[PDB]
Amino acid sequence: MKNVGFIGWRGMVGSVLMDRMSQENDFENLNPVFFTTSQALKSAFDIEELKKLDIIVTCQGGDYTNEVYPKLKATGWDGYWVDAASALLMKDDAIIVLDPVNQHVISEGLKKGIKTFVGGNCTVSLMLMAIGGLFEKDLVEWISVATYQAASGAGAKNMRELLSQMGLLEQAVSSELKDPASSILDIERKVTAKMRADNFPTDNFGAALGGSLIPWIDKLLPETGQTKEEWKGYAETNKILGLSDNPIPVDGLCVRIGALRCHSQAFTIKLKKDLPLEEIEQIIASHNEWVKVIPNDKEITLRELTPAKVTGTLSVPVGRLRKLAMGPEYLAAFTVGDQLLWGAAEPVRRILKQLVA
């Protein structure tokens, strides 16, 4: 059995990985060696120890990877490096994994000698898990996107801040909400006053999220006006699909909303042909076992196409499918996916499974 080292397994993403691996009994197929950065297991910084392993799975973070990866590689170590961090995503030296979508690029990279794999993540992987069928059939000309991203993508303390913000907003009008005859305008004024107060916890986001939204995720990308988050759509999507040399346009606005773990996305997909909606649905549904086409019905949409339904599951529902007023080649679609699973830990768990098989 392969000797696998794990770094950052106590973090949020790492913890989801540990839980998923346990659930699937992945540990009975490999020899796990756990590391730690604490001085209170082996040290995550002991290069000689890391060199003894066949594979290293890390969810520790970019700073960690940029520090040890180079040192480890320098020792001649020829093992595999699986990273949940985005540090090496665009390295010609590594492949972005999301096997249900790009098994072919993965299998080839392996034959070629690629030893570094970075997990497909956030909105890009969730998008591909939802409409990968359209790309696989080469029907996508371009895609305009509008996201509704959860706090987990930012971090554990961000999720906590969101929850605290929601509590404070309600607590500001707790009594008013109790009497069925109170003024809704009085209630709103108080809630709004609270989210604008200096003592309203907004350190993690830099603005209120709770009963609001933030139309900016990462840092500015000067050359295009995009934010890093938005830039990933074009770069990472094509790298995953292996179309970096002849990229497909994927662009839009990424917005942070008051959700915990699920990223949702609204799509305006420009197809290259005019296909019956029924066929498009079949193409979408057939791509993988997790995508789930939701009928464009109200009751079914409310019960199935929401973070409330999707959170904590591997299901990737896609619905609201119909042609747009712009034309028969313009398709509308809305999808919801859990950020911690297909958006983070699952692609890593899957590539590991392959490497130790």
Amino acid identity at 65:
T
Computed on alpha carbons and rounded to an integer, the radius of gyration of the chain in Å comes to 22
Is residue 171 located within the same domain as residue 75?
no
Is residue 132 located within the same domain as residue 112?
no
* 287 catalytic residue (yes or no): no
Would you say the C-alpha torsion 71, 73, 78, 79 has a positive or negative sign? positive
Q: How many CB atoms lie within 10 A of CB 155?
A: 14
Q: How many CB atoms lie within 10 A of CB 183?
A: 9
Pick the closest to residue 35 from 61, 68, 8, 66 (CA basis). Answer: 8
Q: CA 195 to CA 209: how far, in whole Å? A: 9
- Retrieve residue 58's tokens: 């890390």
Q: How many CB atoms lie within 10 A of CB 199?
A: 7
Q: How many CB atoms lie within 10 A of CB 174?
A: 9
* 122 catalytic residue (yes or no): yes
Q: How many CB atoms lie within 10 A of CB 37?
A: 12
Q: Is residue 20 within 8 Å of 353, Cβ to Cβ?
A: no
Q: Is residue 240 within 8 Å of 106, Cβ to Cβ?
A: no
> How many Cα atoms within 13 Å fall on the side-chain side of residue 45?
6
- Retrieve residue 168's tokens: 């404070």
Q: CA 273 to CA 275: how far, in whole Å? A: 6
Is residue 152 located within the same domain as residue 251?
yes
Is residue 14 located within the same domain as residue 30?
yes
Q: Which residues fall within 8 angstroms of residue 96, CB to CB, at 6 or more apart?
A: 89, 102, 117, 118, 119, 120, 236, 239, 240
Would you say the C-alpha torsion 48, 50, 51, 53 has a positive or negative sign? positive
Phi-psi region at 113: left, alpha or beta (left = phi > 0; alpha = psi -120 to 50): left
Is residue 221 located within the same domain as residue 292?
yes
DSSP track, 245-288: TSPPPEEEEEEEES-SSEEEEEEEEEESS---HHHHHHHHHHT-
User: What CATH number is attached to the domain comprising 357?
Assistant: 3.40.50.720
Q: Which residues fall within 8 angstroms of residue 225, CB to CB, at 6 or more apart?
A: none
For the chain, the domain total comes to 2
Pick the closest to residue 247 from 135, 164, 341 (CA basis). Answer: 135
Is residue 26 located within the same domain as residue 167?
no
Amino acid identity at 145:
V
Strands (DSSP E) contained in the chain are 3-7, 31-36, 42-43, 55-58, 80-83, 94-97, 116-119, 140-149, 213-214, 220-221, 226-227, 250-257, 262-271, 291-294, 316-324, 327-338
Is residue 78 located within the same domain as residue 227?
no
Amino acid identity at 164:
S
Q: What angle do CA 24, 17, 163 make, to 5 degrees?
A: 120
Is residue 330 located within the same domain as residue 212?
yes
Is residue 183 located within the same domain as residue 93?
no
Q: Is residue 290 within 8 Å of 355, Cβ to Cβ?
A: no
β 226-227/220-221 pair status: antiparallel
- Retrieve residue 320's tokens: 């609201």
β 262-271/140-149 pair status: antiparallel
Phi, psi of 39 (to 5 degrees): -110, 15
Considering the candidates 59, 254, 263, 287, report the single residue annotated as catalytic: 263
Is residue 275 located within the same domain as residue 346?
no
Give how far the C-alpha of residue 60 lies from the chain's centroid of Cα atoms, to the nearest Å.
16
Q: Which residues fall within 8 angstroms of residue 293, CB to CB, at 6 or more apart?
A: 281, 284, 285, 317, 318, 319, 321
User: What CATH number is attached to the domain comprising 303?
Assistant: 3.30.360.10
Q: CA 155 to CA 204: how far, in whole Å? A: 9
Q: CA 72 to CA 56: how far, in whole Å? A: 10
Would you say the C-alpha torsion 105, 111, 112, 116 has a positive or negative sign? positive
Q: CA 265 to CA 317: how far, in whole Å? A: 11
Q: What angle do CA 196, 184, 195 make, to 5 degrees?
A: 10
Q: CA 241 to CA 95: how far, in whole Å? A: 10
Is residue 297 located within the same domain as residue 348?
no
Segments forming the whole domain that contains residue 307: 122-339
Residues 68-71: contacts with CB under 8 Å, at least 24 apart: 68/44, 71/47
Q: Three-state SS for 193?
A: helix
Considering the candidates 122, 254, 262, 287, report the single residue annotated as catalytic: 122
Q: CA 160 to CA 141: how far, in whole Å? A: 39
Is residue 60 located within the same domain as residue 20?
yes
